[PDB]
Design a protein around this nucleic acid. Structure first.
Ligand SMILES: [Mg+2]
Ligand SMILES: [Mg+2]
Ligand SMILES: [Mg+2]
Ligand SMILES: [Mg+2]
Ligand SMILES: [Mg+2]
Ligand SMILES: [Mg+2]
Ligand SMILES: [Mg+2]
Ligand SMILES: [Mg+2]
Ligand SMILES: [Mg+2]
Ligand SMILES: [Mg+2]
Ligand SMILES: [Mg+2]
Ligand SMILES: [Mg+2]
Ligand SMILES: [Mg+2]
Lengths: 66, 57, 75, 144, 57, 141, 142, 62, 100, 185
RNA sequence: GUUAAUUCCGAUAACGAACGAGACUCUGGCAUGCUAACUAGUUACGCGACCCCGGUCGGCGUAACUUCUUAGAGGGACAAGUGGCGUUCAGCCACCCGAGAUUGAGCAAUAACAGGUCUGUGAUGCCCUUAGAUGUCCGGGGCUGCACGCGCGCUACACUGACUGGCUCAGCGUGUGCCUACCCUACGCCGGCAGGCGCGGGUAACCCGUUGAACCCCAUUCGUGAUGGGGAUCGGGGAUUGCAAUUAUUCCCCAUGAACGAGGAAUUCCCAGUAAGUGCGGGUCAUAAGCUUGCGUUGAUUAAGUCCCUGCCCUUUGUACACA
């Protein structure tokens, strides 16, 4: 049951929309820049949204985003 | 203390005191707009403050 | 129900059967001795450690419950 | 030692009760009433008996040497507390009862507490639980 | 009761809150006990921020 | 060379009893052949030298940890009292069947009473125990 | 000469084992008593299997005295199981080459992973309304 | 009737009203030409060989 | 000299604040100090029924209260430790003074 | 013996299975070999990861049963190590060849259940599981109320199931179950 | 379609949101990294004792250090990487690295039930009672009473067992009271025991306590017999509690030794340290666990699915129901 919710996905889409330049295709690099630009009060939620950001990275690399 | 109470029982008993004073002043200051207390107990004295809405009554 | 009567000490024929049939048995436990010559398991242990005292059988594993003895070395 | 010897007592009538000789002595003299496994291993202890023997191996006179131990426990250093007939109500002695005296002494006190009209008393005559049980739910086998 | 509840609920929202919630229940002009319930604004109910966001009375 | 801790204890508990049996100065109580050894069980031991066992089998604990008295010894000889129709529980040993052991082993100089309560074990018995254990290790060899 | 020390834990369910390496003989004893008589002898060469996967050739140089505390029987023997192998590879981190360490740690890896990694399986807490953590009391319909 | 051996090519679905029989298409290892769908009771791995008692058994499975 | 200041409360970060304040007040006046020793905390547990009556489903509360125990060791006579101990304590914390 | 391994006192090599179907499901050989079949556990977490567990560990897990034997695994590895010498004294070879022969015999190749019962083939994992489970039962039914102990019970049930003697309590219900399976098809 | 989930994707007169879920909080697991510790230890060293240079020691004392011990700030896991299936979406599965690739709970919306509680209360309406009391106190009994039925449970039906020795391994805790008069106990003697008498320690990581727990384990004794399995009824004796034990308060000693040979119809709980076996704390407690709430020890069989049964929800449909 590892479906991440809209609370993850809204913030992840906003981060990847405003900050497509400073992000990379691996989790640990853009893990600490999303907490740099965005205030995430829970480190578990921080680790969720950066993972979904890294998941949207290769979709943008492969082709057109939503 | 000379009776030398335990420290589990001391932290239970002063919390009982904090409950009983808060409850007694809910009883007493009801029409006076009571809101709360907290009990800053020090050595050599116990500071006890009330906090309420209407004060001169 | 079923009423079996094991021997409590040996008969002369049963001690003869001990002398003639136990060492060539590949499996030597007091349980199989108790079912093959109708004896209590306690002196099936006690009468068969006599056979180790006179050296006709060989221990492999000794236990509070399962003492297991073997044949003689036939070669 | 291994074979059944001559004079192998299959049967015995000690204190006028039966015992098979196919059993060990220490757990065979438990089959008389009034001697269990605890008191048996003391009356065979005060007698010099190698207690690996079954009840058919032992010879003819120590089977009465063991008898006198029970009728005279204070002759043979068996203490006050180890008995079962301790501090009697009428003569106040410490004794040991054996296989025909137990059911007699069970009369000897229960008709006494019957005829004294005690609450302890009437329950035995009724056939009811005595020591304070709850017979509302348990004990339905005896009556109907 | 219904006018007093709005006279409280407008005040404790114009004094600044994300949302409040006021219940009144019991026997009142009759015998059958009814409970009407007054809300507005946001209100969380589960988890740890119940400890320090809402205050019950 | 050898010591007490380097050898199988299951065989060592027979040799420590045998060395006390060969000495035979242990101040045996008269009630050793009739007594029940604790509350948790009912039946007497099968062997006839249980006190000769339990004396030096108590003394070997007094090399591992001293300052341990009759409460520690009625603890370490506790067992599962089966209460019959109710669930079983842990219960102690008899106090006197360890107290006579301690009074015996302070009589014949193997242990002695010590500060912080209990018994410690004397250097004489400390020599004696691994003197036995060297013989046990030679039996192993 | 130099005190070549490494002092390495090992945890089964509750039991914690503290192995401690020095250079020396093949002295491997747990809490001051040697290995081959440790309760029970039912699984004695289970406790000997880190020696038997390695031989005496590497245990010859290092003598290890192992403390153990807590847990049960199987917990203590599985604690001193992995504590001595983790202590061996932790000594072989520093005082021999790591290209001597790898060829013996991957023996343990290819044999059984629990020989050097911990077991986080712990006792799940009992809940109200049950005799156990998952089991519930009997429910009486009608 | 000989005892035949076969290998799974695909695991498809569960049948049984209680959901207990993994219906699976398999092909034989001596005759790898054609393939038949049979019910298998128990855990069925992909990449698995199994003993079939006959090749005349088949049913309809939705 | 060998003065013990043991502090207790059931709020963690409040006593973590005031013990660090006592450490800073010790460092500022050139005193030798041992670190704050974290004693194994008491977790006082009470499990009662939820229901005021007795019929329902058998559900139980699980109330905890964690009281904490930290201590500071200093080496000075008492003209230095008392004023820094007296200043800046916040309401849950309770300190003590032990000469030994 | 650092590289080659002794199965307790036994050969772990030179035992060749005859069943193609349960090759990776059987577990004795070259990495599956273990000194005693007591272990830490973990093999009951995923679905097919219980097949990476040796048969001696599976039997030492399985044949403890009926409440009083729950949580007694060193107590029963004692029993199976006592039974190993009984196998050696009876048939005269490495007991794990006898064990895998008993598995391939006693494991029912096809059964019948509901989709009225229709014949359904079994899984090889469930076949070795049910082989072990039926070998548990005869070792216990004979040892109940008897002087003839489990050290002979799991011995001779295994020995009879090695050749399929139609006497082992596993083998008789093996004879029942696929017979009624081919009946109701 | 997918997920534990109105959890998301995706179709689309809807778009953007809120509550619930999730998020959060506590706990479990790993970090040879930080801060540390005479009430926690470890390694060395100096002694002591014993063994034939070395070994052992919870035998003593002290130069480092925090590995084990305690608990703070931090970190660590996100379906992250690979390979399949899939709108190539949301996601699922396997593998790699890994301490973890589904730890367990707490909290838990809209509402409803004439569910329960006036015997939790100085929360309360109304009624009854109120001096010969339905107030209060004291004495005695009762709440236990037993042809029967039902439910929650405990012990067994044995040999995988029982008995008797010995080996030997825990964690949650708790412990001197406003009233309150009642603690956990070391050790030494008396006694087989329950217990008694002395001195001590502990208001507590200090003392109990290295909490030497069982099951298990090592060796005995019995032999398929209602047997030493089983331990109900009952007889006698001795202690403790209290003001008082009789309807035996509870314990101890001996004896007596019942049914019970694996339980029909039916039915409960459960998938990982899980069930189950096993014992220990806490509550109630002067006396005290076949209960309950927690804790630890040992530790699996089976399965990764479905709507067959039983429930519950949602869509469609009918309604003359709407206190439904
Ligand atoms: Mg929320
Ligand atoms: Mg939640
Ligand atoms: Mg006891
Ligand atoms: Mg009132
Ligand atoms: Mg009154
Ligand atoms: Mg009154
Ligand atoms: Mg009724
Ligand atoms: Mg009933
Ligand atoms: Mg009885
Ligand atoms: Mg009876
Ligand atoms: Mg019977
Ligand atoms: Mg049912
Ligand atoms: Mg119609």
């Amino acid at each position: 049951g590892r479906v991440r919710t809209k609370t993850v996905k809204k913030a992840a889409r906003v981060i990847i929309e405003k900050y497509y330049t400073r992000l990379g295709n691996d989790f640990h690099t853009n893990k600490r820049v999303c907490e740099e630009i965005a205030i995430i009060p829970s480190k578990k939620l921080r680790n969720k949204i950066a993972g979904y950001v890294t998941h949207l990275m290769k979709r943008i690399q492969r082709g057109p985003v939503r | 203390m000379a009776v030398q109470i335990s420290k589990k029982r001391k932290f239970v008993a002063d919390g009982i005191f904090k409950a009983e004073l808060n409850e007694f002043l809910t009883r007493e200051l009801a029409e006076d707009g009571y809101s709360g207390v907290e009990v800053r107990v020090t050595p050599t004295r116990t500071e006890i403050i009330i906090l309420a809405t209407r004060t001169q009554n | 129900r079923d009423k079996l009567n094991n021997l409590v000490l040996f008969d002369k024929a049963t001690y003869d059967k001990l002398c003639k049939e136990v060492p060539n048995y590949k499996l030597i436990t007091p349980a199989v001795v108790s079912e093959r010559l109708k004896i209590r398991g306690s002196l099936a242990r006690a009468a068969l450690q006599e056979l180790l005292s006179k050296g006709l059988i060989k221990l492999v594993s000794k236990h509070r419950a399962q003492v297991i003895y073997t044949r003689n070395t036939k070669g | 030692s291994l074979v059944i010897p001559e004079k192998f007592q299959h049967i015995l009538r000690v204190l006028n009760t039966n015992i098979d000789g196919r059993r060990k002595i220490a757990f065979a003299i438990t089959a008389i009433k009034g001697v269990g496994r605890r008191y048996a291993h003391v009356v065979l202890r005060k007698a010099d008996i190698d207690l690996t023997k079954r009840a058919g191996e032992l010879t003819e006179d120590e089977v009465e040497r063991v008898i006198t131990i029970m009728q005279n426990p204070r002759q043979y250093k068996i203490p006050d507390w180890f008995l079962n007939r301790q501090k009697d109500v009428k003569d106040g002695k410490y004794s040991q009862v054996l296989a025909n005296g137990l059911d007699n002494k069970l009369r000897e006190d229960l008709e006494r507490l019957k005829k004294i009209r005690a609450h302890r008393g009437l329950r035995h005559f009724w056939g009811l639980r005595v020591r304070g049980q709850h017979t509302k739910t348990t004990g339905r086998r005896g009556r109907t | 009761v219904r006018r007093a509840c709005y006279g409280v609920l407008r005040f404790i929202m114009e004094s600044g809150a994300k949302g409040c919630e006021v219940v009144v229940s019991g026997k009142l002009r009759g015998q059958r006990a009814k409970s009407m319930k007054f809300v507005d604004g946001l209100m969380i109910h589960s988890g740890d921020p119940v400890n320090y966001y809402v205050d019950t009375a | 060379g050898v010591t007490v801790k380097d050898v199988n204890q299951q065989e060592f508990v027979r040799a420590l009893a045998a060395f006390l049996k060969k000495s035979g100065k242990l101040k045996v109580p008269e009630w050793v052949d009739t007594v029940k050894l604790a509350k948790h069980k009912e039946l007497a031991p099968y062997d006839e030298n249980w006190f000769y066992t339990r004396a030096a089998s108590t003394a070997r604990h007094l090399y591992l940890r001293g300052g341990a008295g009759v409460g520690s010894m009625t603890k370490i000889y506790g067992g599962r009292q089966r209460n019959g129709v109710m669930p079983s529980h842990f219960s102690r040993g008899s106090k006197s069947v360890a107290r006579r052991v301690l009074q015996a082993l302070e009589g014949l100089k193997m242990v002695e009473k010590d500060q912080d309560g209990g018994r410690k074990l004397t250097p004489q018995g400390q020599r004696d125990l691994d003197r036995i254990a060297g013989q046990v290790a030679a039996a192993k060899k | 000469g130099p005190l070549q020390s490494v002092q390495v834990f090992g945890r089964k369910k509750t039991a914690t084992a503290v192995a401690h390496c020095k250079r020396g003989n093949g002295l491997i004893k747990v809490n001051g008593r040697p290995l081959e008589m440790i309760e029970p002898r039912t699984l004695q060469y289970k406790l000997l299997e880190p020696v038997l996967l390695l031989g005496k050739e590497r245990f010859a140089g290092v003598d290890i005295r192992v403390r153990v505390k807590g847990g049960g029987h199987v917990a203590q023997i599985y604690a001193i199981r992995q504590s001595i192998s983790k202590a061996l590879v932790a000594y072989y981190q520093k005082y021999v080459d790591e290209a001597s360490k790898k060829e013996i740690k991957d023996i343990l890896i290819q044999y059984d992973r629990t020989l050097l990694v911990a077991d986080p399986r712990r006792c799940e807490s009992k809940k109200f309304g049950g005799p156990g953590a998952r089991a519930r009391y009997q429910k009486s319909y009608r | 009737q000989p005892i035949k051996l076969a290998r799974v090519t695909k695991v498809l679905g569960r049948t049984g009203s209680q959901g207990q029989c993994t219906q699976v298409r398999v092909e034989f290892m001596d005759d790898t030409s054609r393939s038949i769908i049979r019910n298998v009771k128990g855990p069925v791995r992909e990449g698995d060989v199994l003993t079939l008692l006959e090749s005349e058994r088949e049913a309809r499975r939705l | 000299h060998r003065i013990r200041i043991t502090l207790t409360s059931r709020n963690v970060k409040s006593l973590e604040k005031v013990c660090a304040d006592l450490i800073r007040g010790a460092k500022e006046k050139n005193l030798k100090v041992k670190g704050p020793v974290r004693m194994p905390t008491k977790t006082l547990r009470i499990t009662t029924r939820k229901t005021p009556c007795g019929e329902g489903s058998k559900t139980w509360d699980r109330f905890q209260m964690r009281i904490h125990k930290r201590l500071i060791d200093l080496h000075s006579p008492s003209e230095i430790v008392k004023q820094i101990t007296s200043i800046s304590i916040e309401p849950g914390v309770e300190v003590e003074v032990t000469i030994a | 013996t650092p590289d080659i391994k002794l199965f307790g006192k036994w050969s772990t090599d030179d035992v060749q299975i005859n069943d193609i179907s349960l090759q990776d499901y059987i577990a004795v050989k070259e990495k599956y070999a273990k000194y005693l079949p007591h272990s830490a556990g973990r093999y009951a977490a995923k679905r097919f990861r219980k097949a990476q567990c040796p048969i001696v560990e599976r039997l030492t897990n399985s044949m403890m049963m009926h409440g009083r034997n729950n949580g007694k695994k060193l107590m029963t590895v004692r029993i199976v190590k006592h039974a190993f010498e009984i196998i050696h004294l009876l048939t005269g070879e490495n007991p794990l060849q006898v064990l895998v022969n008993a598995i391939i015999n006693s494991g029912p190749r096809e059964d019948s259940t509901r989709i009225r019962r229709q014949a359904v083939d079994v899984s090889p994992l469930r076949r070795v599981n049910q082989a072990i489970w039926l070998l548990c039962t005869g070792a216990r039914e004979a040892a109940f109320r008897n002087i003839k102990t489990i050290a002979e019970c799991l011995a001779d049930e295994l020995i009879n199931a090695a050749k399929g003697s139609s006497n082992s309590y596993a083998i008789k219900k093996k004879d029942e179950l696929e017979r009624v399976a081919k009946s109701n098809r």
